[PDB]
Symmetry: C2
């Protein structure tokens, strides 16, 4: 009866994509949160932070919510047939199929974005259309039972949105207050629309090699879905 | 590298993990930083939600830190009366460039004697406990007093870490990280502060926290008495 929420934990995950939502959702009543990988045990995030998977694919219970985080490690997952098959297995009956940041590229490689409105990190947004999505430039996008959040910190806004859907607005507001989530960022550079042009150029320059490599992975993943 | 800025987080049982992991992912995005997770011995430490984290060094083996940061959580009450942890914090604070905390981590700094006469903040529900530890309580999200920087409740760690990033490096670097994290928040509700949440929600929360507040008040006054002797 407890709501079963599962996050895919993979090598080179961007940990905040997972740990942000995890602390929001684990604050709710009658939930059980799982960290899923091919085997239980340590998984190292892109920053070197060590996390611990609690269950293998096989021991994972049927999930009410599956959530795919993003990170450097998504490129490997986009061409991992075991991971994609596991995601499809769980998406088949989950109440909600969800992701944060570049986790939506993994949903895309699995075939789960075909014809659906979705978002991702601003620097990778161009990769949604070849995976079949209708790209939407909004921070949390819902299409039926699919919810996708934009880049990294959008996971917190995503998780509060999901909390209200699983329970109600009052429950989500109580968690928001406990987390003191009334942000006051010290700069206004969180979006390419508002950041200084010099900052946007530097962020794009740093992402360029990853984007090129992911353009190539994306087109192979799309060609598999087509064939 | 061997010239890296040395950043250390205290990692303790029953920590509120987002107080640590939020700042960690922000600060680990900066050039040539080494981040340590510090406890009495290396190994697994379980956060209040059940998430398992891994301490990388003991108190004894931790190198001199440029930045020390104390997160909060249910486990702070024990830390406020842990002489080994308090001695480590005081030792590192003698030479750190920045002495910092998030949420109820500032109550640990207070128990260590590091808030006497200093402006500081903490989680909204525990803010009254700052004054008995000698602090000047300030109702802002990120409060700076010299080389002391404190953040308010839980998610304030992200705002705190971007503020610290600009001090360690510069505004341009902190803005780049903000953009990489797509940190343009759009909360679905407006209940993140007791001033804006529905009154029914604020009351429910105070109702829930009352027992913890009364227990932490007694710990706080015991810790204050040790500073006075």
């Amino acid at each position: 009866m407890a709501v079963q929420i599962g996050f895919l934990l993979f090598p080179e995950v961007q940990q905040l994509d997972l740990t942000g939502p995890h602390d929001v959702l684990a604050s709710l009543p009658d939930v059980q949160v799982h960290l899923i990988w091919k085997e239980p045990g340590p998984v190292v995030a892109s920053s070197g932070l060590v996390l611990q998977a609690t269950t293998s694919f096989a021991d994972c219970p049927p999930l009410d919510v599956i959530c795919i985080p993003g990170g450097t490690g998504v490129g490997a997952l986009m061409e991992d047939p075991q991971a994609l098959a596991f995601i499809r297995q769980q998406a088949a009956r989950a109440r909600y199929v969800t992701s944060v940041c570049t986790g939506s590229l993994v949903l895309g490689a699995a075939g789960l974005l075909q014809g659906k409105r979705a978002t991702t990190h601003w620097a990778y947004h161009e990769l949604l259309a070849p995976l079949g999505a209708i790209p939407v430039h909004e921070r949390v996008v819902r299409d039926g039972n699919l919810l996708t959040g934009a880049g990294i910190t959008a996971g917190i806004d995503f998780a509060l949105t999901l909390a209200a859907e699983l329970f109600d607005a009052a429950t989500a507001q109580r968690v928001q207050l406990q987390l003191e989530y009334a942000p006051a960022p010290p700069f206004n550079a969180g979006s390419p629309d508002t950041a200084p042009a010099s900052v946007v150029q530097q962020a794009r320059q740093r992402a360029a090699d990853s984007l090129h490599k992911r353009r190539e992975i994306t087109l192979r993943a799309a060609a598999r879905l087509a064939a």
